Amino acid sequence: QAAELFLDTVSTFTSYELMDYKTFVTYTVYVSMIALERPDLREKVIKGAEILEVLHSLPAVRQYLFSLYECRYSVFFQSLAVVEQEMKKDWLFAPHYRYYVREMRIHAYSQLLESYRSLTLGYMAEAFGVGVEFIDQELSRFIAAGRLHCKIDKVNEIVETNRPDSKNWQYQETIKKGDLLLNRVQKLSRVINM
Amino acid sequence: GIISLLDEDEPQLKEFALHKLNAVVNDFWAEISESVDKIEVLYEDEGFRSRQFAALVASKVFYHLGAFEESLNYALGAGDLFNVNDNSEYVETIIAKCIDHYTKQCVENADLPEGEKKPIDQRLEGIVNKMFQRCLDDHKYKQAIGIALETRRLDVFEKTILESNDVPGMLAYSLKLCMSLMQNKQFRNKVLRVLVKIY
Amino acid sequence: KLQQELEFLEVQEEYIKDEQKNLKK
Amino acid sequence: KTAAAAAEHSQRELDTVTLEDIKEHVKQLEKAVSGKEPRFVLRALRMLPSTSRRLNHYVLYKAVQGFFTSNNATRDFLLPFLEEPMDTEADLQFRPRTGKAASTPLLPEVEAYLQLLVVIFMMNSKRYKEAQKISDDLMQKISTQNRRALDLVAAKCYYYHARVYEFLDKLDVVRSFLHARLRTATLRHDADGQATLLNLLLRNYLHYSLYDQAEKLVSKSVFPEQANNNEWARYLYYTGRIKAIQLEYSEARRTMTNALRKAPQHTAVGFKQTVHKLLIVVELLLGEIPDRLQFRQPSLKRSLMPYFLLTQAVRTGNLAKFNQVLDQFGEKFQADGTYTLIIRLRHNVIKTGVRMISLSYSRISLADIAQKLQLDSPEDAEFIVAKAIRDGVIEASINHEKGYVQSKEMIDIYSTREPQLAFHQRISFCLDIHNMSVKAMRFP
Amino acid sequence: VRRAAVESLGFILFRTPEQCPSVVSLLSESYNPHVRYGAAMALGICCAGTGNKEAINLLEPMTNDPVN
Amino acid sequence: DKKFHGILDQGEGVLIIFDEPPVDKTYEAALETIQNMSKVVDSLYNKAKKLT
Amino acid sequence: DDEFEEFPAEDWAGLDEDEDAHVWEDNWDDDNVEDDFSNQLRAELEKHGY
Amino acid sequence: QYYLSKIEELQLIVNDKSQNLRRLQAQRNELNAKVRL
Amino acid sequence: YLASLIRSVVALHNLINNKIANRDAEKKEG
Amino acid sequence: MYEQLKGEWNRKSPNLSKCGEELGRLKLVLLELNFLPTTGTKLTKQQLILARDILEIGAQWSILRKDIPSFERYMAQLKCYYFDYKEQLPESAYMHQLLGLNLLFLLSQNRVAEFHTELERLPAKDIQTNVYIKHPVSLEQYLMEGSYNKVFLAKGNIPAESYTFFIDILLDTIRDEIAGCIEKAYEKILFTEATRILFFNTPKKMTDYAKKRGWVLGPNNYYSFASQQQKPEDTTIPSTELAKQVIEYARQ
Structure with a gap:
């Protein structure tokens, strides 16, 4: 809901309200990064001429935004940490442990491991920073969180993903919504006959 | 569980455990409901001198289970202990079921009376005869004829008018029942033949 | 009295329920 | 004196308003008797507790002396039992029955309500002996009169009767009354009366922890589906609690979430607190992660904060941290009766952690799982995954070479x-x- | 068969004149005018000299039915 | 960018190319019908008429 | 209308603060305790040498 | 007069059922009358 | 999901509408 | 009446002739008046004391003689006689230990509902003190959490009343449980795998394993048999339930 009503680059003043137009963009970049990973966002925000101009104004802001777009994790994680540090210095710090960097890398890891089947932990570590153990514990923590649809073959140190087909994943969504609505109609069955 | 006291091979121990079952029948239900297997063993153990009253508390067990018809059958097999007490709500329930059973059996055995009748149980006929007899001797003939008609006995109306004819308008009362209410001639013949023989 | 009156009553009401239920098809 | 007089006059006016509410109840039964409609009777019973929180000994005696224009046993019982205050300046025109109304005998339905309305009033006054005598007179009168509409009344009447007897600690003695009225309800097909008596019986077995007898009776007693919503919720929760004690887990979670949904959302604060505690303990034992949105309950913040720490301990798998908080705030868990389960969760934390990590990993090392959940033993890790597969909770298998899992x-x-x-x-x-x-x- | 089977029912059911209007709540309003005609005639037959007060009320709308 | 249909199996050093069947859009369309025919009606109607 | 006080109604006696006073929706993983990620990445960079 | 009451209840159960079955048959017949019109 | 449930929901909607109407009629008849 | 309360049962009662004396005890003393009311009558209170004393003696005799029908009958009599809790009488001593042995063997019968309802009837008897009664609780806890061999070492000592046979009967339930656990989806079972690590180093148990259940021994290895199949599905019970749905809304 934030982004859908906030990419509108029609400011009531040239530099006011949110302390600047540059600060207005930084909010746009942060909100968009939480929003989506890489659909035709090249035609949504990247195509934005005013967007490209302000990233020219802010090279560091341009650095991680292009890093996520280019899916180059070696620079992404360092820049992503800088983003989290910058958000620390901002009063809009509400996702203190949920959606600074963990959600964005959940999108990034999902983007990475999809179109892959068995990518080795050691090589994905150096392609996504350093500290093979650090990525291994990060993957285990995020799989336990629920996202990163994959499993870890610890005895061989492999990441065997489990991507459902378009039929399989969608059928899973229907049975989940079937569970919720059965809970709904059972509640409504409680409403009747009383 | 007290079921072990009945499970022992001592007849006196069995008897001791099964005295107070008819007294704790009101309070304890779950423990007696689950003990159907034990009371079946006692019922099968017919060499023990308390077979009849074991069948009585067997009916008490089926009172807990809710199978009033099965409890009726178990107290039926006991025989003389079916009618230990004539004034209770469970007694009223079982006799009402037994009257319904007697009514159904009488109708079918009168619709096909040329032999091969379903065996009229001596134990069932004995209690039935006792129950409507006292319902006729309670000296409330505004309802004695009504329960008599519900019992569906061929000679019960003749018995009712041969005994103390309290409220002698009962003759006209039963006249309009057979004139209007009872009209299915196949089983109406019993009421009709008594009606013609008296009037 | 009311014993058999309700007996037959149950029969008749029951019959018209099913008979009127036969026309929904 | 002006302020005191105005306050006394105002509270007397509200007393007259409550009397008009009771007078409205009397007119509701007059319409109910005329129309033979028990549904509008239920409306009268529903609206009584709303005004039941503010009654006065004097206004009750006003209704007693007014309604009982003809001398009756109810008035003779309430004359010594009901203790009205001293002389009051406020009086009303007490003449509701005149001529044929006074000549006609009292209605059994209104007789049951006056008896039930006294016993609620005595307990509101925190009296016990007079409350039990009125209630015994209520069941005696209901037993003697055999009208069909009275047994629907008798359902809630026997309900609140045993609730009083629970305070009296006669909850053991009342069992004979509960079973005796169960047999009458079975004879008269009083499903609502049957529903109430089992609910009272289950709470009796709960207060004595007589769960073995409770499960043996629930497993053989059929409960009416069309019974009252409140009675259905109490029975279902009690059935859910005993299955949780019986380790009937999947049935327990189904019953407790149904009982929570069947309970009114605006009311049943005490019932709501119990079901939150029940769902937290049972689902954490299952490893079913507790619903996070339930933590926004405005009436359960302090109780669920240690429960939240318990959920974190279950997910993490640590032992010392939650053992300390159980030593700190475990007394309420003992009062709720889940402390034996609480220790069971404390030692089944590893089992729940194994399931989550098994769902996380494809082929996890038996040494790795031991290190993760603080086992420090390859053999114990092999036993745990052996014990998980035989329970069927997870699909993790064993290959004694390195611990393969399909x-x-x-x-x-x-x-x-x-x-x-x-x-x-x-x-x-x-x-x-x-x-x-x-x-x-x-x-x- | 429809018009017949809805008119020759009061011969059996005149023992229950109160049930003459109860068994025709669909016959008197049926889409077949002949069924309505039979239903009308059935209540007339089963109530010869009875002030039913209910058959008359249900037959009042049929006194002005568009079908002749 | 969904321009290709495959999965990169680095463990085997290969990429498994699969022919994705796109006729399964009934699945997603059905879910949308589930979402916009149930959520917008059951919560709103039966919370307004809480008492019945 | 009754509040069903018969069931044990232990109201929460704190009455001090609402931890999630806003409309924030928490998750089981959102409430874990760590030094976030920036410090952890710095430690990761240090043990690798840069 | 106890089997009296049990049969009345079973009479009451059926009569409650037969209310809507008559009403369902009548309303659907009205629908058939409407479509014929 | 989309024929049996939908039939159940629409039937549920009819009943709760009828129950509301019947309850209001009973309460406001007199 | 009140004859030889524990005259010969206290020191040693190994003979079978004492069964007749016990039977005479049941006929005369146990059947004096009743055991139900226990309102007053301290004589009946002592009658309950001797009733509990002969029940525990029978429990010790039965567990030593290995007679399941007699032992179970004594267990049920013990439960029904103890159903009357009188707090003024001296509790403990005979209560905690015997209830532990009875519950522990009841879990060997695979009954947990009675185990937990007795635990709830004992709020502090099981957790605060009385290692006599929490020993079965600890054994079940370990046997449920993560231990097979650690349970065996834990079973090595019984603090309740000694009588180290409930540990063997639980060992007979865990050999069945282990056999079922290894008859599960396991991939393979070596001969040394089933003989060394778990328990039963080449006893008659080994012959029992090799003959009773499946998974025929290959080369020093038992292997899983045909239990998971592709199952080309005739799909007939889906048709029956579809017909069940059809008839369900083909009517009303």
């Missing part, structure tokens, strides 16, 4: 059909909704 497979014949097989009861709900409409489309 992965999932593509969708088979029944994997697309098990939802529709377990969900095609939609039409079964549709048919009972239609059948209820069949029952509930009276034209007049």
Whole structure:
């Protein structure tokens, strides 16, 4: 809901309200990064001429935004940490442990491991920073969180993903919504006959 | 569980455990409901001198289970202990079921009376005869004829008018029942033949 | 009295329920 | 004196308002007797507790002396039992029955309500002996009179009777009364009366922890489906609690979430607190992660904060941290009766952690799982995964070489059909909704 | 068969004149005018000299039915 | 960018190319019908008429 | 209308603060305790040498 | 007069059922009358 | 999900509408 | 009446002739008046004391003689006689230990509902003190959490009343449980795998394993048999339930 009503680059003043137009963009970049990973966002925000101009104004802001777009994790994680540090210095710090960097890398890891089947932990570590153990514990923590649809073959140190087909994943969504609505109609069955 | 006291091979121990079952029948239900297997063993153990009253508390067990018809059958097999007490709500329930059973059996055995009748149980006929007899001797003939008609006995109306004819308008009362209410001639013949023989 | 009156009553009401239920098809 | 007089006059006016509410109740039964309608009777019973929180000994005696224009046993019982205050300046025109109304005998339905309305009033006054005598007179009168509409009254009457006897600690003695009225309810097909008595009986077994007798009776006693919503919720929760004690886990979670949904959302604060505690303890034992949105309950913040720490301990797998908080704030858990389970969760934390990590990993090392969940022993790790597979909770297998575990497979014949097989009861709900409409489309 | 089977029912059911209007709540309003005609005639037959007060009320709308 | 249909199996050093069947859009369309025919009606109607 | 006080109604006696006073929706993983990620990445960079 | 009351209840159960079955048959017949019109 | 449930929901909607109408009629008849 | 309360049962009662004396005890003393009311009558209170004393003696005799029908009958009599809790009488001593042995063997019968309802009837008897009664609780806890061999070492000592046979009967339930656990989805079972690590180093148990259940021994290895199949599905019970749905909304 934030982004859908906030990419509108029609400011009531040239530099006011949110302390600047540059600060207005930084909010746009942060909100968009939480929003989506890489659909035709090249035609949504990247195509934005005013967007490209302000990233020219802010090279560091341009650095991680292009890093996520280019899916180059070696620079992404360092820049992503800088983003989290910058958000620390901002009063809009509400996702203190949920959606600074963990959600964005959940999108990034999902983007990475999809179109892959068995990518080795050691090589994905150096392609996504350093500290093979650090990525291994990060993957285990995020799989336990629920996202990163994959499993870890610890005895061989492999990441065997489990991507459902378009039929399989969608059928899973229907049975989940079937569970919720059965809970709904059972509640409504409680409403009747009383 | 007290079921072990009945499970022992001592007849006196069995008897001791099964005295107070008819007294704790009101309070304890779950423990007696689950003990159907034990009371079946006692019922099968017919060499023990308390077979009849074991069948009585067997009916008490089926009172807990809710199978009033099965409890009726178990107290039926006991025989003389079916009618230990004539004034209770469970007694009223079982006799009402037994009257319904007697009514159904009488109708079918009168619709096909040329032999091969379903065996009229001596134990069932004995209690039935006792129950409507006292319902006729309670000296409330505004309802004695009504329960008599519900019992569906061929000679019960003749018995009712041969005994103390309290409220002698009962003759006209039963006249309009057979004139209007009872009209299915196949089983109406019993009421009709008594009606013609008296009037 | 009311014993058999309700007996037959149950029969008749029951019959018209099913008979009127036969026309929904 | 002006302020005191105004306050006394105002409270007397509200007392007269409550009397008019009781007078309205009397007119409701007069209409109910005329129309033979127990539904509008239920409305009278529903609206009574709303005004029951503010009554006065004097206004009750006003209603007693007014309604009992003709001398009756109810007035003779309330004359010594009801202790009205001293002389009051406020009096009303007490002449509701005149001529034929006074000549006609008192209605059994209003007689049961006055008896029930006294026993609620005595308990509001925190009296015990007089409350039990009125209630005994209530059941005696209801037993003697055998009208059909009285047994529907008798359901809630026996309900609140045993609730009083629970305070009296006669909750053990009242069992004979509960069973005796159960047999009468069975004879008269009083499903609502039956529903109340089992609910009272289950709470009796709860207060004595007589769970073995409770499960033996619930497993053989059929509970009416069309019973009252409140009685259904109490029975279902009590059934859910005992199954939780009986380790009937999947049935327990189904019953407790149904009981929470069947309870009114605006009311039943004490019932709500119990079901939150029940769902937290049971689902954490299952490893079913507790619902996070339930933590926004405005009435359960302090109780669920250690429960939140318990959830974190269950997910993490640590031992010392939650053992300390149980030593700190475990007394309330003992009061709720889940402390034996609480220790069971404390030692089944590893089992829950194994399931989550097994769902996380494809082929996890037995040494790795031991290090993760603080086992420090390859053999104990092998035993745990052995004990998990035999329970069937997870699909993790054992290969004594290194601890291999199979992965999932593509969708088979029944994997697309098990939802529709377990969900095609939609039409079964549709048919009972239609059948209820069949029952509930009276034209007049 | 429809018009007949809805008119020759009061011969059996005149023992229950109160049930003459109850068994025709669909016959007297049926889409077949002959069924309505039979239903009308059935209540007339089963109530010869009875002030039913209910058959008359249900037959009042049929006194002005568009079908002749 | 969904321009290709495959999965990169680095463990085997290969990429498994699969022909994705796109006729399964009934699945997603059905879910949308589930979402916009149930959520917008059951919560709103039966919370307004809480008492019945 | 009754509040069903018969069931044990232990109201929460704190009455001090609402931890999630806003409309924030928490998750089981959102409430874990760590030094976030920036410090952890710095430690990761240090043990690798840069 | 106890089997009296049990049969009345079973009479009451059926009569409650037969209310809507008559009403369902009548309203659908009205629908058939409407479509014929 | 979309024929049996939908039939159940629409039947449920009819009943609760009828129950509301019947309850209001009973309470406001007199 | 009140004859030889524990005259010969206290020191040693190994003979079978004492069964007749016990039977005479049941006929005369146990059947004096009743055991139900226990309102007053301290004589009946002592009658309950001797009733509990002969029940525990029978429990010790039965567990030593290995007679399941007699032992179970004594267990049920013990439960029904103890159903009357009188707090003024001196509790403990005979209560905690015997209830532990009875519950522990009841879990060997695979009954947990009675185990937990007795635990709830004992709020502090099981957790605060009385290692006599929490020993079965600890054994079940370990046997449920993570231990097979650690349970065996834990079973090595019984603090309740000695009588180290409930540990063997639980060992007979865990050999069945282990056999079922290894008859599960396991991939393979070596001969040394089933003989060394778990328990039963080449006893007659080994012959029992090799003959009773499946998984025929290959080369020093038992292997899983045909239990998972592709199952080309005739799909007939889906048709029956479909017909069940059809008839369900083909009517009403």
